[PDB]
Amino acid sequence: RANTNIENIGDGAEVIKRTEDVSSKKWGVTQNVQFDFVKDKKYNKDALIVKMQGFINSRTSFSDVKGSGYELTKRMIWPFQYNIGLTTKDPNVSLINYLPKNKIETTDVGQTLGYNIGGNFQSAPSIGGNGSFNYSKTISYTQKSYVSEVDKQNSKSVKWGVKANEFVTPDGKKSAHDRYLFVQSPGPTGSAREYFAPDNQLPPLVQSGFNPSFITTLSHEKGSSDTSEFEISYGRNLDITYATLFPRTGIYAERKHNAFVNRNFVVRYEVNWKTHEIKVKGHNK
Ligand SMILES: Cc1ccc(OS(=O)(=O)O)cc1
Ligand SMILES: Cc1ccc(OS(=O)(=O)O)cc1
Ligand SMILES: Cc1ccc(OS(=O)(=O)O)cc1
Hints:
By secondary structure, the protein is mainly beta. The protein has one helix spanning 204-207, and strands at residues 5-10, 13-24, 29-40, 45-57, 61-64, 73-87, 94-99, 108-116, 120-124, 135-142, 146-153, 157-164, 166-169, 172-175, 209-210, 214-221, 227-246, 250-272, 277-283. The chain is elongated. Helices cover 1% and strands 61% of the residues. Strand 17 and strand 18 (250-272) form a beta hairpin. It has a single domain (6-279), classed as Leukocidin/porin MspA (Leukocidin-like), CATH 2.70.240.10. Strands 1, 2, 3, 4, 7, 15 and 16 form a seven-stranded antiparallel beta sheet that branches. Bound molecules: (4-methylphenyl) hydrogen sulfate (3 copies). The site of one (4-methylphenyl) hydrogen sulfate (6EI) has 7 residues, from strand 18. One (4-methylphenyl) hydrogen sulfate is lined by residues 63, 75, 240. One of its GO terms (cellular component) is extracellular region. This is Leucotoxin LukEv. Its main location: secreted. InterPro entries: Bi-component_toxin_staph, Leukocidin/Hemolysin_toxin, Leukocidin/porin_MspA_sf.
């Protein structure tokens, strides 16, 4: 036990802390995942608190459009939604909590999952409210201009979507569905980049990417089989904005919504409930 990260959380209980870091340069994703085993002599089930952090590249790009008739048409690809999900198919595991649990629209998200000896979990949509738990884990992320929704939740899977909502533009607030979002008149230098809002008008989730912070707890009956597999998916859905310069009537824009869906990096992990170990089994790199 000397070379394992173990926290004593009270009489008869401890937490075994594991981590995995799995990246894909092709998908532009890093999964930095924490897997905390709750070991409690007064709780008849095993529990693994999984905290999903890392990075999902926005994959925003600006390009020329090839072909006759498209010489004054430029393309901006950008992420309408970030996808984060954890799924299992094993009968021996179920999801017993998830955070965030409800839709959250604030720029900052900060929530806590608390555990008390005897199998008691609680969640709160804030950080620093309680010093009452035997163990706690928190999530924290910023999602300026985007909102978080639970797109799917059930005993085997949880999926969150962090979706474009409303943006601050020089002309005022703009809906994420406004076909003229990010479009501007550049030509003088005629670069594809100049047909779209400069980097200082693009919020972090468009310019750079998203740093997820989500939790779900896996539950396993002691006495069922030693291992379970589960998949964690991080990715994005991209929209396209096309901007065409008509020298006599100005800039014209068209949006292709959900242009590239589920561009996701999916990693399959195995939890060994008996040895308190996590292994990477596969991925779609
Ligand atoms: C055209 C295009 C758009 C996005 C790309 O990155 S992906 O989302 O990681 O697949 C790659 C090519
Ligand atoms: C540079 C580039 C990027 C995306 C492309 O696919 S499209 O948007 O469906 O035309 C084609 C070329
Ligand atoms: C919103 C959302 C979240 C995760 C997704 O990937 S999956 O878990 O591999 O299906 C897809 C959509």
